[model samples]
Target: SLIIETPSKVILFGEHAVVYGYRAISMAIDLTSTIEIKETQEDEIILNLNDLNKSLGLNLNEIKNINPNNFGDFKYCLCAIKNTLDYLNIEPKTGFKINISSKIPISCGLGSSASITIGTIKAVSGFYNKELKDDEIAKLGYMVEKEIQGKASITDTSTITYKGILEIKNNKFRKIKGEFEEFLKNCKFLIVYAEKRKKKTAELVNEVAKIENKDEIFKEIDKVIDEALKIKNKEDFGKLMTKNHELLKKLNISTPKLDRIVDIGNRFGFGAKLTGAGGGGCVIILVNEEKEKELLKELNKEDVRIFNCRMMNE
Candidate 1:
């Protein structure tokens, strides 16, 4: 039996810009998804998602229903996991038990889904004794996400694949050294969550291609990301986040609910911005822990969850 706990990630200095081949900084946060796979001899496979309470066959029939071709990203990614078993040449004589426990929120641009994908695959890898390196694992994982979304950015998986702060420029990742944990050790995020809305990453990504002068907007985002890289500390980090939020707004990803959270976060003296695909996700803010008591009070109605999440790295 083997277990893998992969950390969630946040694009601290880049978002949409990274997709356009701009260098983005991706940091793994403390939130995590932990999975374990145990091999046993039964004619069936057992699955358990601690929080979701969902189960299916090792063949993953539930996913196949929506993606019959198994060519889409999710199904295709599962296929890669299945293929990994080929090396054993030994069919499952018994069922295996797979379990998952995660704290990362899904679809909030926190890399929760990606972590699950990686962690699940890692669990299976342990059962087969096929030891693939991070890049190999990341390569297989990215292919899954890319195929599923059709239009996707290459940032999330690479950060996990390489295990460090990545300077993602031109679709290539350069791992850099930074005290990622220290950056957020004393920092608290005045985060807010909404019941996610539509027009997700795929739509917004497609829209970027439709703009008459898309390069101009891309260039603007590129500059903002670059400026974010040059900052010195938490305050500088906060400023860059604000700048990134503005760029995201120009891209039309942010919603009125998100705007309200931003207002509440800023009023409390914390610098804030929308963290992900935007119809809904967490708006992370840099705030002094001392004010957390009142910060939650003022943003009570707007407040969903405040995460003092640590930045995780490979």
Candidate 2:
């Protein structure tokens, strides 16, 4: 039996702009997706998704040719399994039962897909006792997301895989360190679910691509990322978060609900921003520890889910 756990992620800065070869900062959150796999006597792959209440069975040999288009909901999971097997040149002689469960919200920009994909890859690889480095797992997870999403960034997978803060640019990434990391470690974070996303991440990414003066906007976002990296305190970093949200708003990805959440968060919290692809999703707020109770009390009046989380550095 093999069990793999992968954390979710929140993009702290540079959301849509990162797609254009600009810098983005992200951190792994405590919210996670867990995969449990155990070998079976039957020659079939059984998949149970507890959160989604979905179950699937597959022949071990048939997984190699499984068409993702045929299974819309499980495309990412299936692709991950196939890709991992192909990468390791493994042909299964037996079968297994895989169970996936998650606490991360789906399609709400908390890297749920990336978490699950990475978890699946790790579980599958570990099932065969194949030693895959963190980079290998991250790369394979990114490939799975790109296959399903049509286009994707490596930031989410890398950050979640490494379980820490990551700075990504032009498809390249490195774990954050020094002052910024120290600041993040002590900060209190909150994730407020504004609403379900109205559009897919790839849709929002493409929408940003067609906007006029997008490169100029991305440049400004890049500037914010640069400034954010240098700030050692929450006050300064929080302001940069608001600035990044403003840049995302200029891209027209912000929705009424998302904006309202950000506005409320800023009114009481240190800083707030629409975290992922926006257009509806969740807001990541840097909460002031002194005013944490007041912030939560006020936000509770609204009809949104709130999660108190910390950066998962380990």
Candidate 3:
């Protein structure tokens, strides 16, 4: 049996703007998706998704017949398997059973899909006794995502695969270093799930496209990312985060629930903003160590789920 784990990610700064060739910053959180693969005598692939309480079986020969254009819960996973097999130039005569479990919340802007896709690729490659570098794994993961999403970005897969902070610009990303990286390493992040997104990411992106002053909003978001990279302390960083959220709000993706969460965080002297595509999703809050206890206590009063995590390193 082979086990693979990949971290979930949060966009620290830059959200919709990244799609427009602007810079974005993202960090991998401790929450992860785990894949456990075991070979079976039966010549069929079995997938057990523990979190969704769903299971599937696919005959090895039927794998190529699965269509990416069709919608299904297992679309991403199945595509991942097919892609990995094609990449390795292998015709499987045996079968494997895969058990997937995740701590990351789905569809709430935490890179759940990326985590699963990356984990599946790693597991498949490892099961075939082929070792792949981080770069190779991330590239394959991105391909799988783009293949399914039709217009996916490399930011999420790259951050989750690299397991640290990444700075993405012009569709290119690199591990963050220096003072900014050091600052983020020591900071705490609180993710508050405002609600499950009502609109799909593609829908929200299209909506942003039709908004007036779209270019100006993207430019402002880019400036926020640049300012975020130079922060000297968490407070400064938090301010930039709130500023970024406001810019996203202007894009008209923010919901009342998300806004309320951010409002509460601001009242408590912390920086907060809606993360991800934001029709409805999570709000990432910068934690002030001195007041974290009170912050959590107050936030608990709201009807939302809270997750406390830090950046995953290496």
Candidate 4:
């Protein structure tokens, strides 16, 4: 048996603009999606997702014909397995029981989907006795996502894969050099998940793609993020978050719920902004360690979920 744990990420700067070839800074949190896999004697694949309490079964004989576009719950897993097989030039084999669980919030811009893809790749590749590098696994996940979503960025896949403060631009990545522990010690993060569900990320990403003058907006964000990377104070970080949120708002992706959370952050906390694709998802807030508990108490409201987390190295 093999167990794989993949971390979830939050965008510290540059969200929508990263898709347009702009640089983004993101960190991997401690929250993770866990996958457990074992080879079985039966000619079938069984999956149990403990977080959702969902069990899915599929026969090995039917694997090849299973459409990736079927919108089935296990499509992501199937895609990961297929992509890994194609990469390794191996044929699928029978008898694997996979169990999955997660602490990350789903569809809330927490990289939950990417975590699944990564964990699946690790488990399947390990089962085949094929060792895969982090970059190799990240590229496999990115290709699968691009194929599914029509367009995708490697930031989430890479951040979760590499697990550090990542700087991504021009289809390349490097870990941002710094002592993050001091920064982490002084800052606290609050994550808020929307109560209501919303549109799929593929549709929203397509909408952003069609927006006019988006490239120009992204260019401005690039400058802001460059300046943001140098900031060491909580007040300045919060200000930059607000600045980034304003640019995201210009793209019309920010919703009332997201704005309310950001407002709460700026007023009582440090600063806040929508963390993911942004039509509806979670928002990240920066606050001082002393003010963390008070800020969470202030953000208490209906139609949202609030939690605290810190950045960590993988």
Sort by TM-score, best first: what order? Answer: 3, 2, 4, 1
Q: On residues 1-314, what C-alpha lDDT tens digit does candidate 3 reach at each position?
A: 98888899999888888787887888999888899999998999998988889999889998866885573777777788888888888887899999999988889879888898899998999999997898888998899888887777888889998888898888899789899889888998889997888788889989999998989989988888777888888887888889889999999899999998998777674689999897998999999988888888888999899998899998
- lDDT tens string, model 2, 1-314? 97888898999998877777777888999887889999998999888888779999999889999887688667777889999999999987899998989888887889888888898998999889897999898899988877876777788889898888998888889788898888888988899998988687778888888899888988999888888888988887787888889889999989888888888778788889999786899999999987888898888989899998899986
| Segments of candidate 4 deviating more than 4 angstroms | 92-94, 180-186, 195-197, 202-216
lDDT, model 2, position 221: 90
After aligning candidate 1 to the native by TM-score, how far in Å is the CA of 188 from where it should be? 3.9
Q: Roughly what TM-score does model 3 have, to 2 decimal places?
A: 0.95
Q: Name model 1 segments beyond 4 Å from true.
A: 58-80, 87-94, 150-152, 178-187, 210-214
> Number of clashing residue pairs in every model?
8, 0, 0, 0
Candidate 3 colliding pairs, count: 0
Better of 2 and 4 by lDDT: 2
Cα deviation in Å at residue 177, candidate 1?
1.3
Please say which candidate is ahead in lDDT: 1 or 4: 4
Q: lDDT value for candidate 3?
A: 0.87
lDDT of each: 0.65, 0.87, 0.87, 0.81
Which residue pairs of candidate 2 clash?
none
Model 4 lDDT tens row, 210-286: 88978888988898887787778888889889988988888888898888888888888778888878788888888
- How displaced is residue 195 in candidate 4, in Å? 4.3
* Per-residue lDDT of candidate 1, residues 165-190 (tens digit): 67778777877664444455545554
